[PDB]
Amino acid sequence: KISTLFLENLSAVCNKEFLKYLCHQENIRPFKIQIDGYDENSSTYSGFIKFRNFEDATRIFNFLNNRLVGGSIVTTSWE
């Protein structure tokens, strides 16, 4: 069942390339990695990763949830 992890408070270095690398390191093929928002107030990005199933999403959620990257704590939500 499709599982989407929404992400915000992403520093500049917590970028699409980094997220793609994390998925590759876990042998996970997401349907989509999309960083499509920028918040001027906090100078951070937002977006989502859409996974094929909850099992894949779980592993990346565990890595990212409340992780400090580039000065900002990655903030997540399930859908």
Contact of 49 with 23, CB cutoff 8 Å: yes
- List residues bridging with 37 in a β-sheet: 46
- List residues bridging with 69 in a β-sheet: 72
Helices 16-25, 54-64: crossing angle, 10 deg rounding: 120
Number of domains in the chain: 1
- For this entry, resolution in Å reads 1.1
Q: Domain range holding 78?
A: 1-79
Taking the C-alpha atoms of residue 15 and residue 19, their distance in angstroms, rounded to an integer, is 6
- List residues bridging with 44 in a β-sheet: 39
CA distances from 51 to 2, 5, 18, 76 (A): 6, 8, 16, 14
Contact of 33 with 49, CB cutoff 8 Å: yes
